Fold this protein.
Amino acid sequence: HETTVFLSNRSQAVRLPKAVALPENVKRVEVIAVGRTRIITPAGETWDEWFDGHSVSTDFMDNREQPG
Amino acid sequence: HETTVFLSNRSQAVRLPKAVALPENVKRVEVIAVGRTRIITPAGETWDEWFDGHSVSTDFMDNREQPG
Amino acid sequence: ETTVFLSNRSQAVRLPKAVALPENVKRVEVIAVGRTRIITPAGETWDEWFDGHSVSTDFMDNREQPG
Amino acid sequence: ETTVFLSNRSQAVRLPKAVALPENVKRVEVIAVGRTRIITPAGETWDEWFDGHSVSTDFMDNREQP
Amino acid sequence: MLKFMLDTNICIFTIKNKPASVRERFNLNQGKMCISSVTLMELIYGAEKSQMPERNLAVIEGFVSRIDVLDYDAAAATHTGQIRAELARQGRPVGPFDQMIAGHARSRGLIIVTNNTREFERVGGLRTEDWS
Amino acid sequence: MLKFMLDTNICIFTIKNKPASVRERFNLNQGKMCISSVTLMELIYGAEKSQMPERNLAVIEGFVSRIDVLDYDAAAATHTGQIRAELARQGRPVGPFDQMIAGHARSRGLIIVTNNTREFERVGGLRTEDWS
Amino acid sequence: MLKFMLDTNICIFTIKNKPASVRERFNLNQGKMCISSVTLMELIYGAEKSQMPERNLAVIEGFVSRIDVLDYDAAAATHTGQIRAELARQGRPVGPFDQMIAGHARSRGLIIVTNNTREFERVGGLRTEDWS
Amino acid sequence: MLKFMLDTNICIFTIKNKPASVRERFNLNQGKMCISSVTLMELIYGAEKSQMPERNLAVIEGFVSRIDVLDYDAAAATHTGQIRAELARQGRPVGPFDQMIAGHARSRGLIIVTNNTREFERVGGLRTEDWS
Ligand code: NA
Ligand code: NA
């Protein structure tokens, strides 16, 4: 079996000035269009997604053991 | 539409996939930080997105209530 | 940490922008204590203000806060 | 290749002869306390504080960590 | 560089009505506009006492994010004190929030943008514009 | 760090009367007191509408120089906005400048020093002290 | 800006039961919630001593990534120092961690979100809310 | 760079007794010493509950002004949480603030300077040092 190694097409891109830069713990992002404008959002900051997701065990912090 | 973030020449940047690319006439943009999101607006049209959505309830400050 | 130097005939200490003085502070008091010196902005004591000039008698008889 | 420029002016205190520093003080450590600044001789930064500055007798006889 | 300070009235008008003419003015003057924190206070108040505070705050966040909010500092305080005193002599009555805004713009040599220039013209050394 | 925010009332009280009890207070707490720029505005208006603007301004400026003046910022404005709405649904009337001062102190977790502690007790999450 | 500080109790309760009423508050207030690093310490401790440390750490990282963690700083510490003395004068018994959280929140003009407002009540200059 | 975190004990000791042996150390290690904000919190409480608060606060201020007060952060919080679980397992008892101070030191790779040294020994990966 044999095939070709090609270069992808250049992508439209936008630079973000330092003043309005995302945090760096942010590295993956979702984008939606509204008219001639595009809205950029960090992915997986959904509260709903987290609430619906994994649970903790049932023992977890049944006692806080904060010093009397 | 998901996407990725990359540093380009000592500055944050954002790929815009074809399904979300800006029109051809948009050559410069203005990036606005609203909380955790960033809004990419064609230079000269910074307010179009805000004027078009983002309605306040109809009661909002019918009365300013400045003393005097 | 800075280096003692001279300026216009006398001794001087530089203040690193970290521990700089407010742009207000134009003149300063100095006290000696052992090998250490203490700097205090001049005219920031209260007695010198209380004993000092007083305001005219009508001053803010009316605050004039609306409502 | 780069252009030569001028540094920023730093803040400095004229130190009157009546209150000048010993000759063996060429390094100095400047502490800020309130609107007050304290000039100490390098390596002698803690002398002024150990000297004056006593705390009332009752001061933390008990720490009261729970 | 900042040229204009939007008063509270113009903001309320814009926010409630989203007028086409104002959109054109804003787009044109983007980067030259600001409000005083005094005006922010009123807008926060407006939202906080409204039917839908978080909804309304979100809209205000959008608006504010595109402009500068100037802190009301000693200089603004000093001009407002003067202005208040100059006005009493005239007997020209102005609200207190408006007085602080007028003082704030004058302290920074800004043009007050408003929807009724009547009030702010009774004030010395102050340029106004009607963008409604 | 700052601990006390002197409202407009003790300022007038203190400036008009130079009380000894208060002198002791300031000596004891020097360095830890401030006023909001809102109060500065009031003091300045006070002097400006005086009969001795000249002299009265000079006294005020000697009072201020010994005290910190905090800028009225976006946090102070937000708290004020919240407070004005909090008080509306309770029918508790506080003045506009008092409200801004309250908002300001709360945002910074400062203790409001006053003599009219009654007006400030209406406000939530706020601590007062009578220094008269 | 930041508005609410979630105490350790409300966090435990939220993480264990993922309740609809809280979800709705979280959405409504996205971006305005933080916790003290003091609470983060407690949560890490809860997971490490846990029967499923791996699993539990994981849910906690999902939580922390969506809310800010404020560093407990000097201003936070100064208020806690004060709060501990205020309380001991009144024989009001409040836990050490809760006291730091209370001080942290007060230093920043933040509202404490808790499900036991009954003990944070004992602190002055402090607003609390019960998100169930 | 910083090398030393003074624990709470060595601070109460030093401040009360002003021991010249410690005066030596400090002068030598000036610029390499810090305390956790947690310890600052204890010292503040000390002054607040004492007979002469303003006086004692001022001594504490001169001490604190000479060193770094490190904000108790997420890493410090994480180290403390692990440490609490590690000691709880091994039934080694250590006080809550000491736990946070220990956690803080370890997260920064700093040496803990104590009075007693005995309690901090039970903590893994933590270097101590007696300066009394
Ligand atoms: Na408990
Ligand atoms: Na009006």
Chain H has one domain: 1-132.
